[PDB]
Structures are given as structure tokens and as C-alpha cells.
PDB file of C-alpha atoms and ligand atoms in Angstrom:
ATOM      1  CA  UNK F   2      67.397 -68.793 -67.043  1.00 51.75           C
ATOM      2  CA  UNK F   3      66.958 -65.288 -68.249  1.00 54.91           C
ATOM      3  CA  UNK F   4      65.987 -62.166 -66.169  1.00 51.59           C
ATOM      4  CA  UNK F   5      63.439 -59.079 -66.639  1.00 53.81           C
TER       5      UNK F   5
ATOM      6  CA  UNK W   1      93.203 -42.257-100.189  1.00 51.42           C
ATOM      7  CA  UNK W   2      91.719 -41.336 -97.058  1.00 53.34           C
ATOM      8  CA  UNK W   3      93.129 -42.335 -93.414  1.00 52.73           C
ATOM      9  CA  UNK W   4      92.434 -40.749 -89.613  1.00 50.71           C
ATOM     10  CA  UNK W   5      94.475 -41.888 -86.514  1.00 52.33           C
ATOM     11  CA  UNK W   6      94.759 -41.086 -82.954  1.00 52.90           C
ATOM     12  CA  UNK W   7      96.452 -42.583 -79.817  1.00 55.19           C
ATOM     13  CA  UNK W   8      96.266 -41.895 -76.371  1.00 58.11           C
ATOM     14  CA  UNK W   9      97.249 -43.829 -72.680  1.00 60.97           C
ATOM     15  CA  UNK W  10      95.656 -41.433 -70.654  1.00 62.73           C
ATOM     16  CA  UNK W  11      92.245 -39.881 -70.873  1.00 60.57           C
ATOM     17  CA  UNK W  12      91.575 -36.219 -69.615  1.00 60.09           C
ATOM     18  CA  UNK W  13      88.702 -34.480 -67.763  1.00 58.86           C
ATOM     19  CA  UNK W  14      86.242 -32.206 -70.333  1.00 59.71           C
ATOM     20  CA  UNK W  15      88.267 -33.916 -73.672  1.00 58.75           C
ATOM     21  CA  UNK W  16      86.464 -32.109 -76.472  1.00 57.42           C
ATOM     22  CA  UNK W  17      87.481 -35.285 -78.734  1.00 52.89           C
ATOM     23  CA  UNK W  18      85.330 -37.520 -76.759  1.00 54.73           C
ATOM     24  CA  UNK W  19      81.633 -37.163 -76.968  1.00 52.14           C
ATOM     25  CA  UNK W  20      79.996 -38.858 -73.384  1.00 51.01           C
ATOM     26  CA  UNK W  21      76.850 -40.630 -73.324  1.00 54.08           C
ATOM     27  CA  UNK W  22      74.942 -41.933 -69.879  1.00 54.49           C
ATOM     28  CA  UNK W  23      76.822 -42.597 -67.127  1.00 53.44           C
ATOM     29  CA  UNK W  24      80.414 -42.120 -68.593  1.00 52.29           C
ATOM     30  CA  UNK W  25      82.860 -39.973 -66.694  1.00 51.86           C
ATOM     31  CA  UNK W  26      86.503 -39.297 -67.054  1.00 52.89           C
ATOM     32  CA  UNK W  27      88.237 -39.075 -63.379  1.00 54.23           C
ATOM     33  CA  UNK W  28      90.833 -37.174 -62.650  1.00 55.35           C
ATOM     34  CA  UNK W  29      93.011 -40.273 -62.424  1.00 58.31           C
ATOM     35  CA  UNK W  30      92.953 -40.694 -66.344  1.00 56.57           C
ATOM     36  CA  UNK W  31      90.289 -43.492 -66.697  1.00 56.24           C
ATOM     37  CA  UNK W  32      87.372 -43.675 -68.875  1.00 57.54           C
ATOM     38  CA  UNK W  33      84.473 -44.541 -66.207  1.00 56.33           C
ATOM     39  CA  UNK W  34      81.778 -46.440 -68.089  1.00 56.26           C
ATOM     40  CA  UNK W  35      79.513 -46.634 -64.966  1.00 57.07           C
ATOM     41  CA  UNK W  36      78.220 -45.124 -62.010  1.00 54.32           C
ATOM     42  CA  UNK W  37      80.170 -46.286 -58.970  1.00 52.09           C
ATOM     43  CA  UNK W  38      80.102 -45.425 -55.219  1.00 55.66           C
ATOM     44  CA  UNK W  39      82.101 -43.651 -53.067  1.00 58.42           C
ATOM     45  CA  UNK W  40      84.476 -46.547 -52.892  1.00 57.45           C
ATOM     46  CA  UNK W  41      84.385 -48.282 -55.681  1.00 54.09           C
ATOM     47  CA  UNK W  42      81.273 -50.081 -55.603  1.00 53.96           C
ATOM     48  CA  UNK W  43      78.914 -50.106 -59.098  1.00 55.61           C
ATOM     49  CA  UNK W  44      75.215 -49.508 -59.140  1.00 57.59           C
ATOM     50  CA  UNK W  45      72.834 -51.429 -60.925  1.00 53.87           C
ATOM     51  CA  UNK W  46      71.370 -50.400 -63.952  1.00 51.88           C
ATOM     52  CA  UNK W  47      74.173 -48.172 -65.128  1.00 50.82           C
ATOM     53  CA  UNK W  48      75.124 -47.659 -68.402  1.00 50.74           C
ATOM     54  CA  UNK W  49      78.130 -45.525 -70.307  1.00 51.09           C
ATOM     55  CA  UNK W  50      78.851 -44.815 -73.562  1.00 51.64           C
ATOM     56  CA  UNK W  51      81.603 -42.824 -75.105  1.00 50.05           C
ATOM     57  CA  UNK W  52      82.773 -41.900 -78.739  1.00 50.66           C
ATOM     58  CA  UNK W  53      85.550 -40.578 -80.682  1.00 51.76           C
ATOM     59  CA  UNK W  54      84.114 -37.113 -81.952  1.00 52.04           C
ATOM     60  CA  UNK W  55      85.175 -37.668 -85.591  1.00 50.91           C
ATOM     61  CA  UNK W  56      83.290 -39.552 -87.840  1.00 51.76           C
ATOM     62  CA  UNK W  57      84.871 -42.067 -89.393  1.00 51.41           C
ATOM     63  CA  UNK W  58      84.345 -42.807 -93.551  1.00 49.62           C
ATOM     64  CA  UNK W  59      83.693 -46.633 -93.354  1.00 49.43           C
ATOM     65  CA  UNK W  60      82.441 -47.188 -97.030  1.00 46.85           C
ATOM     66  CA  UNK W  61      81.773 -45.421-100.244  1.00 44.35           C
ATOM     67  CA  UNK W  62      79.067 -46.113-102.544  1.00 44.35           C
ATOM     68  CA  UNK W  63      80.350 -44.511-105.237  1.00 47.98           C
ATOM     69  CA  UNK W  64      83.684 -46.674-106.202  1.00 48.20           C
ATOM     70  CA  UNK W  65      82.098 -48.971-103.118  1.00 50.00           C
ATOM     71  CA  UNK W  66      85.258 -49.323-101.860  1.00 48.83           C
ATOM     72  CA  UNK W  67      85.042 -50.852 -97.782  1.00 49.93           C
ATOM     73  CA  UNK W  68      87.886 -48.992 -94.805  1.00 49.52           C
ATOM     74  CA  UNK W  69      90.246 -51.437 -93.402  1.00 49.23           C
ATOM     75  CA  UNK W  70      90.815 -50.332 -89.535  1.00 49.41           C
ATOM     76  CA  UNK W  71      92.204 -51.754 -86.500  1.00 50.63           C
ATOM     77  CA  UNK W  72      91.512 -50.749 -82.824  1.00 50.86           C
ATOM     78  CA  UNK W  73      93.495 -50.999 -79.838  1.00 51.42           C
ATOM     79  CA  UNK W  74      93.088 -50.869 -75.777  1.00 49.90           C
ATOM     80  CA  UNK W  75      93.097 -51.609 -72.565  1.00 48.67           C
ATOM     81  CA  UNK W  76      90.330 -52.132 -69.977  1.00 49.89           C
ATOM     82  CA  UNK W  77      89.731 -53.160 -66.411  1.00 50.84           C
ATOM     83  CA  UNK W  78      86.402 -54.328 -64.551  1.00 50.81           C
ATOM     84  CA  UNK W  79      85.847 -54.633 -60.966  1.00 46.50           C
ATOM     85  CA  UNK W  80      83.246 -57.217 -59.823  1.00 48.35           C
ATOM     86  CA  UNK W  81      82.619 -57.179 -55.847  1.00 47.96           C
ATOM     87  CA  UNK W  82      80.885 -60.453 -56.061  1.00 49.10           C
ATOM     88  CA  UNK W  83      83.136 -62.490 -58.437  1.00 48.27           C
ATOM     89  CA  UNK W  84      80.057 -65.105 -58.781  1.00 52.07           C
ATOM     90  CA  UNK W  85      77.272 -63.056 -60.479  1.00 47.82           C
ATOM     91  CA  UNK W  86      78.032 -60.231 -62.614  1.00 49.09           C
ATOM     92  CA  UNK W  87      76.811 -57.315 -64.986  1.00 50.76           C
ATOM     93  CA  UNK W  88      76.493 -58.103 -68.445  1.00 48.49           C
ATOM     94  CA  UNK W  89      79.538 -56.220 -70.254  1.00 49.85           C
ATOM     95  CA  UNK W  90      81.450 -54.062 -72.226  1.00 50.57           C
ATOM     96  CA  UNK W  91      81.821 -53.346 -76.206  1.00 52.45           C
ATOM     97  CA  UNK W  92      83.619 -51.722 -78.614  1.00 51.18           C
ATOM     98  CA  UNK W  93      81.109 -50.804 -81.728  1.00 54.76           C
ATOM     99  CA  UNK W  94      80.756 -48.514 -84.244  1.00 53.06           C
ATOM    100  CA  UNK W  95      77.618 -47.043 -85.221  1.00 51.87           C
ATOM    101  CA  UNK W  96      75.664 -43.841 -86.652  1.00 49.88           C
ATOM    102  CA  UNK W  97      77.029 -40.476 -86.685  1.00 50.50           C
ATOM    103  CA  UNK W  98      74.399 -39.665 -84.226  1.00 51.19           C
ATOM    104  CA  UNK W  99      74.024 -42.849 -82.472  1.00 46.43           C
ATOM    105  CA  UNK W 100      72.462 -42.725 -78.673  1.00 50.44           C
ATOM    106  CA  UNK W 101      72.266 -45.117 -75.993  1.00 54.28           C
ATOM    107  CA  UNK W 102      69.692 -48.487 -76.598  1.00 55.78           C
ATOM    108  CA  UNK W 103      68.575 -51.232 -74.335  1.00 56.37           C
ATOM    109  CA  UNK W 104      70.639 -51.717 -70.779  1.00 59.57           C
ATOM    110  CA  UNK W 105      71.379 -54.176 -69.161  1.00 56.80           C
ATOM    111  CA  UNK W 106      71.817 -57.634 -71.033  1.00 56.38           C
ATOM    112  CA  UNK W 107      71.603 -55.145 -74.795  1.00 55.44           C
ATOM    113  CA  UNK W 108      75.113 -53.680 -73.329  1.00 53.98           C
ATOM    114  CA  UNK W 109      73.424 -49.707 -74.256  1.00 57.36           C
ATOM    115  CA  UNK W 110      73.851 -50.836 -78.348  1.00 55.66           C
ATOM    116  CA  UNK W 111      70.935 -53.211 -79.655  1.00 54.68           C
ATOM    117  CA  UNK W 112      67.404 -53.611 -78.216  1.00 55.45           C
ATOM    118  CA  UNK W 113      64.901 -56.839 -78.582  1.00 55.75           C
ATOM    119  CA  UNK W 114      62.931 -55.246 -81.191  1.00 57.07           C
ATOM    120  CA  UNK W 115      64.017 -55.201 -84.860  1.00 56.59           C
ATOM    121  CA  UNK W 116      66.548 -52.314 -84.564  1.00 54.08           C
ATOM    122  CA  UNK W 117      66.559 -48.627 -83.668  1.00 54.00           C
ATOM    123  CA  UNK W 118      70.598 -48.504 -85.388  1.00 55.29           C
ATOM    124  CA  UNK W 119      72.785 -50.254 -87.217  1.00 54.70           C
ATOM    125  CA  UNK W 120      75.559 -51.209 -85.177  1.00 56.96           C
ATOM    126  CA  UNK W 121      78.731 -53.552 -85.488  1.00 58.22           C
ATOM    127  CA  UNK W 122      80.262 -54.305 -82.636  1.00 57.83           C
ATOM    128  CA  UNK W 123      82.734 -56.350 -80.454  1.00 56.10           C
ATOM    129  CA  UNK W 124      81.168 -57.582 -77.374  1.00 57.13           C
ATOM    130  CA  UNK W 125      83.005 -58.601 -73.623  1.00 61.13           C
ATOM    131  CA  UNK W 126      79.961 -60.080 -72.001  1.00 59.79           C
ATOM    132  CA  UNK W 127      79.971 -61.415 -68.308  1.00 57.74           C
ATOM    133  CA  UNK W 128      76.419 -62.593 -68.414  1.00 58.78           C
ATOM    134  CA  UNK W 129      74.250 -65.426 -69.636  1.00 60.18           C
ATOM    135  CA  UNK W 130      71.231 -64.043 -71.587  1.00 63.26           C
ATOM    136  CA  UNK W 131      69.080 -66.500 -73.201  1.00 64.89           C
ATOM    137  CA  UNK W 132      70.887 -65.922 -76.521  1.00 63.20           C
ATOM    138  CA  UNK W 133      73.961 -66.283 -75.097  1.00 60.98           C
ATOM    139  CA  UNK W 134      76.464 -69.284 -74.704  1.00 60.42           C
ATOM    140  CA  UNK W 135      77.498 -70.351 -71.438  1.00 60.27           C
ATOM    141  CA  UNK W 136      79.904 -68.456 -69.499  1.00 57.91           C
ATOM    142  CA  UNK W 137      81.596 -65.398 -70.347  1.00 60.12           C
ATOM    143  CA  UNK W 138      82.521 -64.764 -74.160  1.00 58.88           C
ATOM    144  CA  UNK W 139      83.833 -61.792 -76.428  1.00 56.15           C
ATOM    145  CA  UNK W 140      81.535 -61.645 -79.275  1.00 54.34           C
ATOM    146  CA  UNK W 141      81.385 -60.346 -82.527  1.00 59.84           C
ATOM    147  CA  UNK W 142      77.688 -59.024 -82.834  1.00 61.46           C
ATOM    148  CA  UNK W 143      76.191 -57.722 -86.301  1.00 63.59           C
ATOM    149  CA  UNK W 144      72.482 -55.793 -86.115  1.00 63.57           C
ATOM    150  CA  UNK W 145      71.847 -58.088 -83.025  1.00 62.59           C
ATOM    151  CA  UNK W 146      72.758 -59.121 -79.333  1.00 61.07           C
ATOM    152  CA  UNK W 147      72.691 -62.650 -80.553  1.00 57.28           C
ATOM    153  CA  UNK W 148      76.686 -62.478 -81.823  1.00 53.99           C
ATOM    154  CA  UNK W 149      77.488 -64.183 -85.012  1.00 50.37           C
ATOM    155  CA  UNK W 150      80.357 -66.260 -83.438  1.00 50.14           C
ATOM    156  CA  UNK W 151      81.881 -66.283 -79.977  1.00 49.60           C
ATOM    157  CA  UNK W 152      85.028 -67.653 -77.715  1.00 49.72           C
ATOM    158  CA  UNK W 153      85.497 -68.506 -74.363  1.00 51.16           C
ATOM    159  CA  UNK W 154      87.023 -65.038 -72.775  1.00 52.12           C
ATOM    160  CA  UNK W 155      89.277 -65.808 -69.255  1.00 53.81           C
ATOM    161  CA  UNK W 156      87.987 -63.357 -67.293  1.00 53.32           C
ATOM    162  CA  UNK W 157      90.266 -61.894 -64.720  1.00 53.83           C
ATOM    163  CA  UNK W 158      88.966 -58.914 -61.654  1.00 52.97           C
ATOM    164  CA  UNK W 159      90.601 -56.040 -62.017  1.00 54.78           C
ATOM    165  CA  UNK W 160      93.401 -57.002 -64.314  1.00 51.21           C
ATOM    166  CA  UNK W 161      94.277 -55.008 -67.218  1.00 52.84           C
ATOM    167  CA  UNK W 162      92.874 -56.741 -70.610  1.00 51.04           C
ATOM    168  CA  UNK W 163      94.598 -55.671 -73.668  1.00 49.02           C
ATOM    169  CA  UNK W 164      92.533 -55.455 -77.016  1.00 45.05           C
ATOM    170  CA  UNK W 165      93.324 -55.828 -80.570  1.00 42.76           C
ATOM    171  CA  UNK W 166      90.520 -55.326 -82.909  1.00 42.93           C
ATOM    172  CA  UNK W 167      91.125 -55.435 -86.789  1.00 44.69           C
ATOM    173  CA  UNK W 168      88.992 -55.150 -89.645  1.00 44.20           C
ATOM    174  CA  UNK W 169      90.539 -56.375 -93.318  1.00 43.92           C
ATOM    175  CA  UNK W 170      88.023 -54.647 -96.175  1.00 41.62           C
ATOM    176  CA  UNK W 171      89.978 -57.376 -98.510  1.00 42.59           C
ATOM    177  CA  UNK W 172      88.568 -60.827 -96.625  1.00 42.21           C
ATOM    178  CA  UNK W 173      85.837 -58.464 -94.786  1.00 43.13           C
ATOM    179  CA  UNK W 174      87.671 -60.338 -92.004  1.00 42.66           C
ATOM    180  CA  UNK W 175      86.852 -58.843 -88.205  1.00 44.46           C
ATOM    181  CA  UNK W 176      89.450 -60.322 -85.963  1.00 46.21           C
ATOM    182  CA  UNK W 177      89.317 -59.338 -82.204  1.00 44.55           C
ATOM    183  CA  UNK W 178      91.681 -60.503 -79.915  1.00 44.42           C
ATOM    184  CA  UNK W 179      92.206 -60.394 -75.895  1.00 46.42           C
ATOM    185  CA  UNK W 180      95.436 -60.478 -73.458  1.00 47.52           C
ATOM    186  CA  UNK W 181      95.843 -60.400 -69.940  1.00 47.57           C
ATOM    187  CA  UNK W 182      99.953 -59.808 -69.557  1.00 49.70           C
ATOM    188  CA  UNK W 183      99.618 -60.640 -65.717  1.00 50.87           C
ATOM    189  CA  UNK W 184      97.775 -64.081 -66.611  1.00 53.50           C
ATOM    190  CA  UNK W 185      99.955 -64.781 -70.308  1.00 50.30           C
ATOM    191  CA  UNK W 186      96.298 -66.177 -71.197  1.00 49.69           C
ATOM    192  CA  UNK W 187      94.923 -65.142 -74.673  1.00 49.70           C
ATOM    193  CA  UNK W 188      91.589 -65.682 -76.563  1.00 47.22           C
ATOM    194  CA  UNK W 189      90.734 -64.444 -80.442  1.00 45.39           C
ATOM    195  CA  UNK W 190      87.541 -64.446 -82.174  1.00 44.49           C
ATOM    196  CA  UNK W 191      87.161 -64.213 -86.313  1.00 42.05           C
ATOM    197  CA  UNK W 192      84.526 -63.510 -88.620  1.00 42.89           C
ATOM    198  CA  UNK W 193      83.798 -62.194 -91.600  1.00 43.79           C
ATOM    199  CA  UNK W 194      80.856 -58.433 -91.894  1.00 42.51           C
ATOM    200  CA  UNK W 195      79.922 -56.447 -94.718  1.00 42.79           C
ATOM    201  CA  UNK W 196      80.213 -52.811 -93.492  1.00 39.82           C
ATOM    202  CA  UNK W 197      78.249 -51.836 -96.917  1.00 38.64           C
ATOM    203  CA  UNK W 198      74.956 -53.755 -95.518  1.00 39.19           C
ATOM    204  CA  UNK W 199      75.180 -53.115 -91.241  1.00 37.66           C
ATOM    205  CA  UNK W 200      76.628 -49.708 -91.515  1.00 37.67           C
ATOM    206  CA  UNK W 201      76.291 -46.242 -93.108  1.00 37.72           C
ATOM    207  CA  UNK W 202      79.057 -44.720 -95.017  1.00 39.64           C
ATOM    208  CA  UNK W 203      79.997 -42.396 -91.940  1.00 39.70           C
ATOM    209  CA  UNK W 204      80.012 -43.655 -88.591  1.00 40.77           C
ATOM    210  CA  UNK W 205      81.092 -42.758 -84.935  1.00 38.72           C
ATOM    211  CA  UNK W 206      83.254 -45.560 -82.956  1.00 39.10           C
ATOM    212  CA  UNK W 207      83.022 -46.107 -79.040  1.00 39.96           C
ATOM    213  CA  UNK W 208      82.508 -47.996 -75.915  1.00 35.31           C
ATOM    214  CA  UNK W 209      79.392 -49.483 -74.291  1.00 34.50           C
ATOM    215  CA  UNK W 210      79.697 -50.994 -70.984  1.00 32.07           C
ATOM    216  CA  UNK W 211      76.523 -51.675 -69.363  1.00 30.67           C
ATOM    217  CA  UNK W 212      76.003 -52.715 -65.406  1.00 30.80           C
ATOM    218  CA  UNK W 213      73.325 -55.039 -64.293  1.00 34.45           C
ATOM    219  CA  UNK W 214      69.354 -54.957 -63.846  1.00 33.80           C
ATOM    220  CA  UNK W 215      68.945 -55.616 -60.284  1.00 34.47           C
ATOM    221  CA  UNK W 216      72.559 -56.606 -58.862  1.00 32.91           C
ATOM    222  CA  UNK W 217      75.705 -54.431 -58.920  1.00 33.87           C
ATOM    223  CA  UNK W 218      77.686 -57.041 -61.255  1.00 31.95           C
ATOM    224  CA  UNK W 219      80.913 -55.145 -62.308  1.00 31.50           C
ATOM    225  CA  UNK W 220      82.090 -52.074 -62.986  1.00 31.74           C
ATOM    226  CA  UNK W 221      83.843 -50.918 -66.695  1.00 33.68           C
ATOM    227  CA  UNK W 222      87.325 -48.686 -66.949  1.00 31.10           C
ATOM    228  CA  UNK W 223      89.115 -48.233 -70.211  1.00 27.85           C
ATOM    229  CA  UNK W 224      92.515 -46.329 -69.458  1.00 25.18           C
ATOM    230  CA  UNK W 225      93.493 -46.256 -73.083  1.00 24.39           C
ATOM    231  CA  UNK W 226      92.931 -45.968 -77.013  1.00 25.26           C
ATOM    232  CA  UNK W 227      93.990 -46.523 -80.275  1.00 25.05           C
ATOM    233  CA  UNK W 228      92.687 -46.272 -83.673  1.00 22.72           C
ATOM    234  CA  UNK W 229      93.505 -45.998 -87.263  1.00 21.22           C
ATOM    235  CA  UNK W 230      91.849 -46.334 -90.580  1.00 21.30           C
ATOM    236  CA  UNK W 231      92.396 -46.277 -94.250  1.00 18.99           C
ATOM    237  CA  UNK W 232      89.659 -45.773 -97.220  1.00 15.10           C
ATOM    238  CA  UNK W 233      91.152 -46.484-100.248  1.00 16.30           C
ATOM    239  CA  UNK W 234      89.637 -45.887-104.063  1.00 13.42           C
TER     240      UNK W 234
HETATM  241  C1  LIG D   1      97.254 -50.179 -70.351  1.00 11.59           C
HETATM  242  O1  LIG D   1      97.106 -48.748 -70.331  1.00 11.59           O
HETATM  243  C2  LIG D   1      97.353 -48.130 -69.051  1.00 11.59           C
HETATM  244  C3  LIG D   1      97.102 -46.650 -69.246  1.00 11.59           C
HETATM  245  O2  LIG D   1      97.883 -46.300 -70.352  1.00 11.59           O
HETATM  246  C4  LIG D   1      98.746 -48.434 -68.440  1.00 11.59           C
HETATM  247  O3  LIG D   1      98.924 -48.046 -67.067  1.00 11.59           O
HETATM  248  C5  LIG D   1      99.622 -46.792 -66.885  1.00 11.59           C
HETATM  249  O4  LIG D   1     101.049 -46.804 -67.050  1.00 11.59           O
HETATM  250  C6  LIG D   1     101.916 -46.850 -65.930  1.00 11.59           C
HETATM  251  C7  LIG D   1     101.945 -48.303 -65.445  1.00 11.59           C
HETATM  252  O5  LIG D   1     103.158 -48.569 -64.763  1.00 11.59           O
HETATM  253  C8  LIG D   1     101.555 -45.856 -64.805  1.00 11.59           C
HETATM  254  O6  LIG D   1     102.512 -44.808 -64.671  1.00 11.59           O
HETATM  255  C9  LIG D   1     100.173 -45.249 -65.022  1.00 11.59           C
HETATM  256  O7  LIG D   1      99.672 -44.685 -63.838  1.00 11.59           O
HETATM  257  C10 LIG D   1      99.156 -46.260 -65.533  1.00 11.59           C
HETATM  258  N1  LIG D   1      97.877 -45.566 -65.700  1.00 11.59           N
HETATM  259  C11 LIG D   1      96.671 -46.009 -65.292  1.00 11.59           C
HETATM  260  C12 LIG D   1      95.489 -45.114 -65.575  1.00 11.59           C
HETATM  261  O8  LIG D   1      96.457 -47.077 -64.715  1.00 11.59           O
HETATM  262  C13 LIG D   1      98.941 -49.940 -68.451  1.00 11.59           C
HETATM  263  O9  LIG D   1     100.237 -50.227 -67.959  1.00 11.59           O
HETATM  264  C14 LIG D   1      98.696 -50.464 -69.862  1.00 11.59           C
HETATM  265  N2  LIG D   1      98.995 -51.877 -69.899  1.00 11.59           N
HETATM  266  C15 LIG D   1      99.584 -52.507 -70.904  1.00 11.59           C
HETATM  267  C16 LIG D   1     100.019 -51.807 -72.169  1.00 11.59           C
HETATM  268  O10 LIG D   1      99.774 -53.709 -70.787  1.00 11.59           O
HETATM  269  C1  A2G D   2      68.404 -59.303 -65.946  1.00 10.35           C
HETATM  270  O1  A2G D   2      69.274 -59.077 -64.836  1.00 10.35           O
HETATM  271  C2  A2G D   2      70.574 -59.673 -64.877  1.00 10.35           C
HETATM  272  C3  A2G D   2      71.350 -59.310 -63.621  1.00 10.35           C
HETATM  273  O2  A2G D   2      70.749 -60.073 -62.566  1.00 10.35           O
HETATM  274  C4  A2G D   2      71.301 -59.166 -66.102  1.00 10.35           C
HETATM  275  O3  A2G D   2      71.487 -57.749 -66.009  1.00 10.35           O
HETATM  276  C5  A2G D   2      70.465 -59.520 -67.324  1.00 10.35           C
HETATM  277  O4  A2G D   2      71.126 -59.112 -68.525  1.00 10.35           O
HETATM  278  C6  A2G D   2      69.083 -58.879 -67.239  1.00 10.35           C
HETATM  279  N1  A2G D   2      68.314 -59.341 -68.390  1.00 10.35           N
HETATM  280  C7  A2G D   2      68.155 -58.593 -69.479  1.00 10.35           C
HETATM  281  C8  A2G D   2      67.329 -59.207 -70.575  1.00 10.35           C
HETATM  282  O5  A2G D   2      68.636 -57.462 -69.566  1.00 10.35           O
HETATM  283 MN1   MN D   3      74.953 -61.400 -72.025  1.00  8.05          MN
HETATM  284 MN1   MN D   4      76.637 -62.309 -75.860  1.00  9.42          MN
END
């Protein structure tokens, strides 16, 4: 799971 | 026959052979501060630091086309308040004579998720899992991307001093980067092989990138020393  | 060197074990406040990007700061204690940090220690979110050597550096020719063989050397600390969740990294690259900063964050300040803005080569000590990334922290050898070519497990210790040894062989185009922790007697090494000729110009600048994290604190970046050398031959 990736942020931004 | 050309060939540059320098050493050093501590930095020094206002250095005119350094040339500071972002956040970067030299304290008075001798370290090169990557980040922005509180009054006690503490990093901020979305920092980012880079620093070069001032010289340029003659990687490759194109007239005989002739490659520099080089090898780097030093030692760097982090400092992670919450040892569970931390702040994407720190690199060693070269780069464009006039190379600024790029993307934050998960781009460690040296690559961004467009095609390119430089051409950058570059040794990564990542702490966070992007999508790209493998799981858990890694050093990386990264061409013209965030996505590294190859990467190794890297034993991540707070606070402890991490000795680097980063070599480039123009003969195998062989970059070999390896990692020590004295304290710990752990080691990790990474190898694979770049062509400067096609991911660099002919002159570049080397330095550090050590980027904080989006929205949480993560860990902070200190190198406390340097070495480099490098040889163009005909
Ligand atoms: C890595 O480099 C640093 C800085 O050169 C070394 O730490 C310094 O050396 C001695 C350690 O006993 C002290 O007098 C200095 O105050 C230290 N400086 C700083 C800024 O911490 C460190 O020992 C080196 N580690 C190696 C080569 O393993
Ligand atoms: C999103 O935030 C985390 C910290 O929570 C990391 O900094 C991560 O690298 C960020 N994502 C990107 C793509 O930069
Ligand atoms: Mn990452
Ligand atoms: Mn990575």
C-alpha cells in the first residue's frame, strides 16, 4: 500500500 | 590520465567545497545534516537535503570513449523516533553539473514519476515500501529510475554508524556498493553492472540525497564523513  | 581525490572525517560550517541544496546544514558538531530537525533531535516531515562535492567530476569521454573507474567511501547515521514507520531514505548519486533537487519523499530528492527531469545514477538506502519497491528496507542500485535495477536486504540499525563502500570498475562496468555496521559485525553488498556513457553526461557532480517522509517524521539523515577518488584513463 502506497501513499500520496 | 586524469584522476581527482579528496578525504575528509569531519565536515565544517560554510565549506566552499560543498555546494548545499534544500534542507542540508553542516552543524557545528562536524555532521552533514540532510534534514530539518527540531530542537532536540526530532525530524520534520517532508524534508529533504542534498549536498555535492563542488568539482565536477570527468565520468566519460566521447572522444577515445574511454568510461572513469571510481570508488566512494562513508559513514552515515539515521535517527528514527518511531522505529516502526519510517522516512524513505538516503543516496549517494551522481548527476549533472547543475543538478537540483527532484521529487521528495518516496523519489529520495533524485528521480520523479514522470519520464525524467536528469540523468542520475545512484546508490539508494531506502527505509520505505513504495509500490516499486521490495519489501522491507534495501540499498539499491537505481539507474534513470526509483524502481532500482537490483536490490539486498540492508540491516538497518537506529543511530549506529553505517560504513559505505561504493566502487565503480569502467572494465566490467561493475557498480558494487557495500554496507557495515562495526557495532552489529553485520554486512550486506549489492552488484550490478551501468553504462555511465548512456545514464550520464561526460561531467557530473556527486552527492547525497536523503529525503524525510510525506506526512510522518520517519528518520532523520547524518553523514559525518567522505571519501572519493577517480581515474579517467585514455
Ligand atoms: C565514521 O566517521 C566518524 C566521523 O569521522 C567517526 O567518529 C568520529 O571519531 C571519533 C570517534 O571516537 C571522535 O573523536 C569524533 O567525535 C567522531 N565524530 C563524529 C562527528 O561523530 C566514526 O568513528 C567513524 N566510524 C568508523 C570509521 O567506523
Ligand atoms: C507517502 O508517505 C510515506 C510516509 O508515510 C512515504 O513518505 C512515502 O514515500 C510517500 N509516498 C510517495 C510516493 O512519496
Ligand atoms: Mn522507498
Ligand atoms: Mn527502493
Amino acid at each position: 500500500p502506497d501513499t500520496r | 590520465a586524469e584522476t581527482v581525490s579528496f578525504s575528509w572525517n569531519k565536515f565544517v560550517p560554510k565549506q566552499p567545497n560543498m555546494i548545499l541544496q534544500g534542507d542540508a546544514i553542516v552543524t557545528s558538531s562536524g555532521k552533514l545534516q540532510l534534514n530539518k530537525v527540531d530542537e532536540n533531535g526530532t525530524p520534520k516531515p517532508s524534508s529533504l537535503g542534498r549536498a555535492l562535492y563542488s568539482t565536477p567530476i570527468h565520468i566519460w569521454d566521447k572522444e577515445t570513449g574511454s568510461v572513469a573507474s571510481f570508488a566512494a567511501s562513508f559513514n552515515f547515521t539515521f535517527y528514527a523516533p518511531d522505529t516502526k514507520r519510517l522516512a524513505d531514505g538516503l543516496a549517494f548519486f551522481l548527476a549533472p553539473i547543475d543538478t537540483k533537487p527532484q521529487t521528495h519523499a518516496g523519489y529520495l530528492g533524485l528521480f520523479n514519476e514522470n519520464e525524467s527531469g536528469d540523468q542520475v545514477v545512484a546508490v539508494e538506502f531506502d527505509t520505505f515500501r513504495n509500490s516499486w519497491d521490495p519489501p522491507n528496507p534495501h540499498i539499491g542500485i537505481n539507474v534513470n529510475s526509483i524502481r532500482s535495477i537490483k536490490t539486498t536486504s540492508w540491516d538497518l540499525a537506529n543511530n549506529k554508524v553505517a560504513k559505505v563502500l561504493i566502487t565503480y570498475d569502467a572494465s566490467t562496468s561493475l557498480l558494487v556498493a557495500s554496507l557495515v555496521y562495526p557495532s552489529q559485525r553485520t554486512s550486506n553488498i549489492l552488484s550490478d553492472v551501468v553504462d555511465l556513457k548512456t545514464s550520464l553526461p561526460e561531467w557530473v557532480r556527486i552527492g547525497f540525497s536523503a529525503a524525510t517522509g510525506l506526512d510522518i517524521p520517519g528518520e532523520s539523515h547524518d553523514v559525518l564523513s567522505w571519501s572519493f577518488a577517480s581515474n579517467l584513463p585514455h
